[PDB]
Design a protein around this nucleic acid. Structure first.
Length: 960
RNA sequence: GGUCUAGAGGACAGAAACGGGUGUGCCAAUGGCCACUUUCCAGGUGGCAAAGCCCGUUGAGCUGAAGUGGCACCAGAA
């Protein structure tokens, strides 16, 4: 069962007497839920936090005043009851109403309908509370004096109107979601404290004073105004400073800092730290232990994640405006106020919805009416809905491009909404759910485990499936019962998605070439045959000559304005007293990426200051940008540019990540410029374009998994048999010598991979597509066919080429086009096939990582086959390595084993998600026996060995 | 055609006025004017109004016929 909430808009222009009754109805259920929810917070009688400690444990006295007042209100003069039975039944009824407060389970259906009418183990609390004269603990909101409107009179026989049943139930669900929220937040904060405590007791044992001296250093920074990003180049500094003396002039310490920048300006920063680290006070940090600051930089990241987390949740009462709660409805046949969806009551595409119980006002009185048909504004989403049964005004057919047979569905609930509208949830029934099957017939071959849908295979029942479901070659959604196919998707930066289709067939087949295939563990007759592999590109990821020129000029103006602020922030330092602000920033500023207008004015104020004094210059140049940043803001906010009419290929940015980074880089610039709510119109536009990318990228992967192709004028065609298991990449927080930073250093990529996963699970619930993930660590570094690792390179027709010549001094020799050059983020993947240097195996980098996930799927791959973290032990005398048991499968093959060495770079063996570094070394291996004959090689030595193979040859073929 | 395997939509560099509708947003797609926010910039706030918007109907245009919009959507809440 898959629900789809179709939000639509009502038109009430011809009937103001119903709109005013709808806004009033919104205030009735909101003030009602607020009345029923506040009572639950008092019955909770705990801390009850907020944005602070307001109403902190003070509900005990506020409940008693609200509880004692009802004893004299209901004619009770027998057993009064001490202040214990008051608080006893208070917490006892609360844990009885919402079972999520103690860790139990309870659905809000038979809870609100059970406790409302009596109040307006279970039988003991309801009876002992009714003994204390509190038989009427709650008068309903509609019949009391709180509701200013005149509802329909409660009929003789019915206890409570359905309106208050919707308020009392909605208040229970809000408190259920609260206790599960407060507990989960406290549990995550408990694991974060454990992460800090156990990391603190492993690295800072004998170094108790060094931690306190770092807190001296960090407090010295903020009062005068330490992560891994700010320590880039620490070992280079500590190596050259060890050749110096403490009682040396400070210029000598500064001399070594400016030298290490000549090697790599890309990875260096924070000159103020090393200047304050060279002080005679903070020398025990880098002299007593040459790696303490690096060990502490990870400890600061744990506190960074710890500070951005609470140990309690924030409680907010449902206000009718600030924190609104929407008036719910029920499907035609429920037990509360229902609604009926009317198909084509005002026209061909003019729908309407009649409400069985509503409100209407004219001047100042509001009364309850019946059967209020309201037309509905047209929508493309409603075009996919067709009525299935005129006698059942709930059953409906759901249209979708990825299916030629319309799904049978049923209308769900409804709730009237506003923006700071009527949400009609449509329960769409999948094809397998309509056949009477809970899980699809192919859901037994795989086993999605855990939260991230870890896809594991049951090879025993695989042979039985192909014999029951042979390949008849049916295209589209009709072929879900035909054969078995798995599509591996690798979300990338340049190409939005690189996919590869593998079918399972026996023996062999096939104008005369032989298709690629992957061996499947267990069965020796069937083998995963590669069917097709293509690049799925959203509009905006195609690179041409004219498109680059458009992208360069739209960024060059922001390139000039953003780098200008960096020079203005260097000038504001020269107007201070500290040497780091005045002295160091002065000598620095005393190749044309600036605005020539502001560049000329900046050099003028500099030369005038070369001969509070800078405070005038720092505020005269700031006004100059105000002229430039305004003429540029209005040029972006209201300037007219060409826009796509119809369907146009070769788009500028489109749905690419470049368009998302552009919208973000503007928000990050306006936030950094004004601070020398915020941009509500731009921020909401960034989230919309980001939300639009996730929805479009999740549908294109699914439409490809089903075999539909959008061809040109614009029509989806079922061109391939459908896949049955969308194999995604496993997502993890840590990265260790795997992806080139851009596709991971960009904290946007993690949002993309997280957002695509959530949207894929939702959209694939209708098509019965199994969404699973495979471990993606080092999926782009190793080859899929040969299994040998390699460096990422690309061709040549430059950000990467100029740095490639600085490394290898290739300014003299020329080169012909289409020569392989490693960049780190290479467009193509290269790998050695044999021991012959010069002979390599080239393949698209993003597609090789996708096909690598497939090889991991049919072979039950584990990272223990490649990577392994060991500890330095002393087993049987020698100083051998001891592997670490991360995961049950890693432990099976390396339990009793132990790794020894004679050189330190090559290791031989003799018989969570947290990582502590540098305590011992990590080693990896090559499956093809090419690099180091397939032995366990140290991490740094192994990748340099691979780089020496590929990058060694293709450069030796350039100089010669 | 050059280069690269996975042999596919292959892959990187190349080259030649009237009548209706305005669910939520994307696709070079971030609204304008005025007032105020101490003063110009960013951000915010309030007020104002005309429409901008697509879609349908042709005589326009020759890029006699053709074509002047494509795409996706599962909501909600601190």
């Amino acid at each position: 069962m898959a629900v789809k909430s179709i939000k639509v808009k009502l038109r009430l222009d011809d009937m103001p007497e119903i709109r005013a009754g709808l806004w009033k109805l919104h205030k009735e259920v909101n003030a009602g839920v607020r009345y029923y929810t506040e009572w639950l917070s008092l019955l909770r009688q705990e801390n009850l936090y907020r944005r602070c400690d307001k109403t902190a444990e003070e509900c005990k006295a506020e409940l008693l005043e609200r509880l004692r007042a009802r004893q004299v209100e209901n004619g009770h003069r027998g057993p009064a009851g001490s202040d214990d039975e008051l608080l006893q039944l208070a917490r006892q009824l609360y844990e009885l109403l919402v079972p999520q407060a103690i860790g139990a389970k309870g659905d809000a259906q038979q809870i609100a309908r059970k406790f409302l009418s009596p109040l307006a183990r279970t039988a003991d609390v309801l009876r002992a509370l009714a003994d204390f004269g509190l038989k009427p603990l709650m008068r309903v909101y509609t019949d009391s004096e709180m509701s200013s409107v005149e509802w329909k009179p409660l009929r003789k026989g019915q206890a409570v109107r359905t309106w208050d049943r919707d308020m009392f139930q909605q208040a229970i669900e809000r408190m259920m979601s609260w206790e599960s929220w407060n507990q989960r937040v406290g549990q995550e904060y408990a694991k974060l404290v454990e992460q800090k405590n156990r990391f603190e007791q492993k690295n800072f044992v004998g170094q108790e004073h060094l931690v306190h001296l770092v807190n001296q250093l960090q407090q010295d920074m903020k009062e005068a105004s330490v992560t891994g990003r700010a320590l880039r180049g620490s070992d280079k500094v500590f190596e050259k400073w060890g050749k110096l003396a403490p009682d040396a002039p400070f210029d000598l310490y500064d001399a070594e800092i400016k030298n290490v920048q000549r090697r790599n300006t890309r990875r260096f920063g924070s000159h103020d730290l090393f200047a304050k680290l060279a002080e005679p006070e903070y020398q025990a940090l880098w002299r007593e232990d040459a790696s303490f600051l690096t060990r502490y930089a990870v400890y600061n990241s744990i506190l960074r994640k710890l500070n951005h987390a609470k140990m309690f949740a924030t409680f907010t009462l449902p206000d009718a405006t600030a924190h609104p709660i929407w008036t719910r409805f029920d499907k035609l046949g429920g037990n509360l106020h229902q609604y009926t969806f009317l198909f084509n009551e005002f026209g061909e595409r003019r729908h309407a919805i009649r409400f069985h119980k509503l409100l209407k006002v004219e001047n100042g009185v509001a009364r309850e009416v019946d059967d209020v048909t309201v037309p509905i504004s047209m929508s493309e989403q409603l075009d996919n809905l067709l009525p299935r049964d005129p006698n059942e005004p709930i059953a409906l057919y759901f249209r979708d491009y990825g299916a030629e047979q319309h799904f049978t569905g049923e209308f769900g609930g409804a709730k009237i909404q506003c923006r700071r509208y009527l949400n009609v949830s449509v329960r769409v029934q999948s094809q397998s759910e309509a056949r009477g099957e809970r899980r699809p017939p192919y859901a037994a071959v795989f086993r999605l485990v855990g939260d991230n849908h870890r896809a594991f295979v049951h090879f025993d029942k695989l042979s039985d499936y192909l014999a029951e479901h042979p390949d008849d070659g049916k295209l589209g959604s009709e072929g879900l019962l035909s054969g078995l196919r798995v599509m591996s998707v690798d979300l990338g930066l340049r190409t939005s998605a690189s996919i590869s289709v593998f079918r399972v067939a026996r023996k062999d087949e096939l104008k005369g070439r032989v298709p690629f295939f992957f061996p499947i563990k267990g069965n020796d007759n069937l083998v995963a045959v590669h069917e097709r592999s293509q690049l799925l590109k959203l509009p905006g990821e195609t690179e041409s000559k004219d498109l680059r020129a458009i992208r360069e000029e739209r960024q060059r103006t922001l390139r000039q304005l953003r780098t200008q602020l960096a020079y203005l922030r260097l000038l504001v330092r020269c107007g201070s007293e500290d040497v780091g602000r005045r002295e160091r920033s002065w000598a620095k500023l005393i190749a044309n990426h600036m605005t020539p207008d502001w560049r000329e004015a900046f050099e003028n104020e500099l030369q005038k200051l070369k001969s509070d004094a800078v405070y005038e210059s720092v505020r005269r140049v700031w006004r100059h940008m105000g002229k430039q940043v305004r003429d540029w803001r209005k040029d972006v906010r209201s300037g007219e540019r060409p826009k796509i009419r119809g369907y146009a290929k070769d788009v500028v940015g489109g749905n690419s990540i470049e368009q998302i980074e552009y919208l973000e880089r503007q928000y990050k610039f306006l936030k950094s410029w004004s601070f020398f709510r915020f941009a509500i119109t731009l921020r909401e536009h960034i989230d919309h374009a980001k939300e639009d990318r996730l929805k479009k990228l999740a549908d294109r992967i699914i439409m490809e998994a089903l075999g539909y192709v959008y061809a040109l004028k614009g029509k989806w065609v079922a061109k391939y048999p459908p896949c049955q298991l969308i194999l995604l990449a496993e997502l993890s927080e840590y990265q260790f010598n795997n992806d080139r930073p851009p596709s991971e250093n960009n904290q946007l990529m993690q949002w993309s991979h997280r957002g695509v996963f959530q949207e894929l699970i939702n959209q694939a619930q209708v098509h019965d597509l199994l969404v699973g993930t495979m471990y993606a660590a080092f999926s782009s570094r190793f080859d899929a066919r040969t299994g040998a690792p390699g460096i990422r390179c690309r061709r040549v027709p430059p950000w990467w080429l100029n740095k490639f010549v600085v490394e290898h001094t290739l300014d003299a020799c020329p080169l012909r086009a289409d020569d392989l050059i490693p960049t780190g983020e290479g467009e193509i993947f290269v790998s050695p096939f044999s021991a012959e240097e010069g002979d390599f195996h080239q393949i698209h980098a993003d597609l090789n990582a996708a096909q690598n996930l497939q090889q991991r799927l049919w072979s039950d791959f584990d990272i223990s086959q490649i990577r392994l973290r060991c500890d330095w032990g002393e087993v049987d005398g020698e100083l051998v390595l001891i592997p670490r048991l991360t995961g049950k499968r890693t432990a099976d093959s390396y339990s009793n084993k132990v790794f020894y060495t004679n050189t330190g770079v090559t290791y031989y063996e003799r018989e969570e998600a947290d990582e502590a570094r540098e305590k011992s070394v990590v080693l990896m291996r090559d499956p093809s026996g090419i690099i180091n004959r397939g032995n366990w090689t140290r991490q740094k030595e192994f990748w340099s060995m691979v780089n020496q193979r590929i990058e060694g040859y293709l450069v030796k073929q350039i100089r010669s």
